[PDB]
Amino acid sequence: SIAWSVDEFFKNREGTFVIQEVKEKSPWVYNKKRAKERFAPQSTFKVANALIGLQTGAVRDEYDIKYWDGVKREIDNWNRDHTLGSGMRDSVVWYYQAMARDIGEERMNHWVKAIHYGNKDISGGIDQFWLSSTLRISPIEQVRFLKQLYEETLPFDLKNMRTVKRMMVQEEEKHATLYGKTGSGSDIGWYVGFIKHEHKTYILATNIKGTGIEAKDITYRILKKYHLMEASV
Numbered sequence: 096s097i098a099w100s101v102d103e104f105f106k107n108r109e110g111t112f113v114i115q116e117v118k119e120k121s122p123w124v125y126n127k128k129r130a131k132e133r134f135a136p137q138s139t140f141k142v143a144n145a146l147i148g149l150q151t152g153a154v155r156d157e158y159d160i161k162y163w164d165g166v167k168r169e170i171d172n173w174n175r176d177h178t179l180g181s182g183m184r185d186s187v188v189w190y191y192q193a194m195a196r197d198i199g200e201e202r203m204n205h206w207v208k209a210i211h212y213g214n215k216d217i218s219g220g221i222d223q224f225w226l227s228s229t230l231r232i233s234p235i236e237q238v239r240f241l242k243q244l245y246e247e248t249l250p251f252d253l254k255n256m257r258t259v260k261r262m263m264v265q266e267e268e269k270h271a272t273l274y275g276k277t278g279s280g281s282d283i284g285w286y287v288g289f290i291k292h293e294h295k296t297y298i299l300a301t302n303i304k305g306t307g308i309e310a311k312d313i314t315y316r317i318l319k320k321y322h323l324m325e326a327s328v
């Protein structure tokens with residue numbers, strides 16, 4: 096068991112860290128107050144959105160191509176054709192908005208409720224509800240959801256859970272694979288996912304007052320401290 100200590104990574108940011116080995120009964124929590132507070136999921140919702148898009152048949156697989164509509168958006172890399180998988184890696188909002196519209200209100204509502212995704216409130220709008228809007232989920236709830244994704248106990252087809260986990264690969268190392276997703280907006284910084292290291296798997300959520308990139312950085316530093324992730328050798 097790991098004697099977690101992470102205060103040194105949160106000196107300049109208000110934040111929380113939730114982490115749980117999959118055989119452990121409960122997560123370890125830094126800043127329990129913030130860990131139980133629900134926040135807009137921002138781009139971390141792409142994990143659930145992709146599962147639901149695949150389950151409903153709104154998209155075919157991780158290679159389902161959608162065509163750029165020629166509208167120049169804020170991030171250059173968005174201004175080209177994308178797939179479900181490249182859309183998750185590059186957090187391509189327009190792809191996932193198009194998918195959400197195809198899923199539609201009734202199916203999205205059902206599946207968001209079925210997986211107990213925070214307050215389950217998508218009334219903010221079918222392609223808007225996850226960005227600083229009506230839907231909110233706590234860091235503890237993200238870990239509960241991602242634990243079920245990892246252990247394949249969500250009410251999705253096995254194939255769809257395996258597809259989405261492949262789409263989430265963030266770092267590949269000799270003895271580990273990090274899976275995860277950043278979220279940013281309205282000073283809510285997320286990094287959520289799980290790390291497989293040898294025969295142990297840790298489900299995690301980092302949430303700060305700050306950005307997704309900052310949350311991801313904090314996460315890497317914690318995982319490195321405890322040798323779940325290799326150092327920069």
Ligand SMILES: *C(=O)[C@@H]([C@@H]1N=C(C(=O)O)[C@H](S[C@@H]2CN[C@H](CNS(N)(=O)=O)C2)[C@@H]1C)[C@@H](C)O
Pocket residue numbers: 136137138139170185186187188226277278279280306307308
């Ligand atoms: C996801 O969290 C957001 C969407 N994903 C994005 C991404 O690039 O991963 C962008 S966030 C956008 C990029 N640059 C702006 C400022 N960056 S900062 N200060 O946050 O680091 C913000 C896109 C909006 C969203 C759906 O929540």
